Structures are given as structure tokens and as C-alpha cells.
Design an enzyme around this catalytic site. Structure first.
Site, short mmCIF file in Angstrom:
data_model
loop_
_atom_site.label_atom_id
_atom_site.label_comp_id
_atom_site.label_asym_id
_atom_site.label_seq_id
_atom_site.Cartn_x
_atom_site.Cartn_y
_atom_site.Cartn_z
N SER A 95 0.81 -1.22 0.00
CA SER A 95 0.00 0.00 0.00
C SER A 95 0.84 1.28 0.00
O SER A 95 1.50 1.59 -0.99
CB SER A 95 -0.94 0.00 1.20
N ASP A 217 -10.85 -5.78 -2.88
CA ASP A 217 -10.34 -4.82 -1.90
C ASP A 217 -11.22 -3.57 -1.93
O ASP A 217 -11.25 -2.85 -2.92
CB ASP A 217 -8.88 -4.46 -2.21
N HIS A 246 -7.62 -5.93 2.21
CA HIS A 246 -6.55 -5.00 1.88
C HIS A 246 -5.19 -5.58 2.27
O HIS A 246 -4.15 -5.11 1.81
CB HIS A 246 -6.79 -3.66 2.59
#
Ligand SMILES: [Cl-]
Ligand SMILES: [Mg+2]
Length: 271
Positions: A95, A217, A246
Site C-alpha cells: 500500500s 479490496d 486489503h
């Protein structure tokens, strides 16, 4: 001894002439990589680090102005790589860290060979011909609510991140690390995250990028992975994980780790 090393809780494992750098996303720390590490240490030197602002880091070291921009975290990463003598690494970023590594690779091509990213997102809010999964004014209202009632918003944020069903391993663990952050610091990171826009800079990322994300997600729709695949400046490849959430490398390691291992070891061919 290292000031930079202790500040980001740097851990070095295994050995090899190639170094794999593991970065984590918002709400968690380097412990999110516990399932991947034992499969790397035999072939690679593995370096893990915590983002400044994570619950495991010293809150006094969180410069609110320096970390108001994404570039501030990029400086941290470059310093870590220099301190531990890392060149042409395989950067595996989850991320936020993946975007940090992407930006860092532009400043210092010598420190990066390629990037493997998980649940990457160049921009949260929707725009014209860009689908982030959230409308901009909705993002702004959600941030404002996070200010008024931090506890309840963070309480609901954890299931959204972990995804699908249910009270599980990743659920309790992510919730634990999420609430170890100082509220004002976590609020600062979210403001920075919901604020950045890497879309005009994607063409400048020229090193190979392996784009990995789950098929469901809530924070990162599939369209985002397809957008990165099309707008990255150099080589790129996309593989979706048939799972929810996620944090697939924590919530579903059995199917995620083999995919990560492959993309770490495999190189995208020319053209
Ligand atoms: Cl994140
Ligand atoms: Mg420390």
C-alpha cells in the site's frame, strides 16, 4: 547503534547478494510480513522497516510538517537503504510504502531494481477517467468524521481493511496495530494519504513494477491495478489474488505468499 535503524525498527534477516526490502501499509507494521519472510531468507538478504508514525515508532520523531507530504517518507526510505548499504534492491511495498518506494525510485534509481506492490493506490478519490472507488467529497466527510469521533471510525475501519468475513487472524491483529498509533499521528497520515496524487508522476516510474492486489479490496478496486499497468513508465505486470481484503499477505497467506515469491523471483521480459 544506527539512529535511522532504531527509529524505523529495522530488522535484517537471511543473506544473499540481492536485498529484498519489505514495506508496510497504514495501520500495521513490519509484522505484517511474517508469512513471507521464511520463504526469502535462504536466497535473499531481507530488510524490514516501520514507517515513521507507526505504533511501533517514537511519536516524538513524527515531524507533522515533514510527513504532511509523501516525499517526507521517501527521504526516510532512502536514508534506510543508504545506512544499510542497499543497492538495486527488490522493493516489496504494501500500500502506502509501495508509493513511497515508487517516488523514491525516481530520486534514486541506483537503490532500486524493481518494485513488487500490494494493494497500491496512486490516488484515493475518483477523478475523470480515474476510478479510485470513492468520491472526493465523501472522502472529505469521512476524514472530518474521523476527527470528531476517532474511536468509532477506527473501529469500523478495521473490518473494511481486513475485508470479507470475519473475526479472524488479520482482524484482531490489524485492529491491535491500528490502535497502537497516537490518534493525532494516525489522523495526520490519513490526511496525507487522502491528499496525494501520483497520477502525473506514474510515467516517471521506469523500473519494473509488479502490481499485486486482491480481487475484492474495498480500499483498492481492480480498476486501480489496471490503471497502474497502463500508466507506469516502464515494464509492469498484474496479478489478482482470488481473495478479499486489503492485507492478503496476512489474511490469506496460503494463496498470497506463493504469488509474491513468484513475482519477486521472476523478471518481466523486454517489449
Ligand atoms: Cl494504506
Ligand atoms: Mg526502535
Amino acid at each position: 547503534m544506527s539512529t535511522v535503524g532504531s527509529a524505523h525498527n529495522v530488522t535484517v534477516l537471511g543473506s544473499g547478494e540481492t536485498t529484498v526490502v519489505l514495506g508496510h501499509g497504514f495501520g500495521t507494521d513490519q509484522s505484517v510480513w511474517k508469512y513471507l519472510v521464511p520463504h526469502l531468507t535462504d536466497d535473499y538478504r531481507v530488510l524490514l522497516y516501520d514507517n515513521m508514525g507507526a505504533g511501533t515508532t517514537d511519536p516524538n520523531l513524527y515531524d507533522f510538517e515533514r510527513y504532511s507530504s509523501l516525499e517526507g517518507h521517501s527521504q526516510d526510505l532512502i536514508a534506510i537503504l543508504e545506512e544499510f548499504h542497499v543497492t538495486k534492491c527488490i522493493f516489496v511495498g504494501h500500500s502506502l510504502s509501495s508509493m513511497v518506494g515508487a517516488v523514491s525510485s525516481i530520486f534514486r534509481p541506483d537503490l532500486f531494481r524493481k518494485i513488487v506492490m500490494i494493494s497500491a493506490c496512486p490516488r484515493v478519490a475518483n477523478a475523470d477517467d480515474y476510478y479510485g472507488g470513492f468520491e472526493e467529497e465523501d472522502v472529505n466527510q469521512l476524514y472530518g468524521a474521523m476527527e470528531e469521533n476517532f474511536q468509532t471510525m477506527m473501529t469500523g475501519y478495521a473490518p473494511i481493511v481486513v475485508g470479507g468475513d470475519l473475526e479472524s487472524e488479520a482482524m484482531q491483529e490489524f485492529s491491535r496495530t491500528l490502535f497502537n498509533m497516537r490518534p493525532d499521528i494516525a489522523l495526520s497520515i490519513c490526511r496525507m494519504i487522502s491528499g496525494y496524487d501520483l497520477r502525473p508522476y506514474l510515467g516517471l516510474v521506469v523500473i519494473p513494477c509488479h502490481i499485486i492486489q486482491s480481487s475484492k479490496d474495498k480500499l483498492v478496486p481492480v480498476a486501480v491495478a489496471e490503471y497502474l499497468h497502463r500508466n507506469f513508465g516502464g515494464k509492469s505486470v498484474v496479478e489478482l489474488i482470488p481473495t478479499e481484503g486489503h492485507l492478503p499477505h496476512l489474511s490469506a497467506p496460503d494463496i498470497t505468499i506463493p504469488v509474491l515469491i513468484r513475482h519477486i523471483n521472476q523478471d518481466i521480459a523486454d517489449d
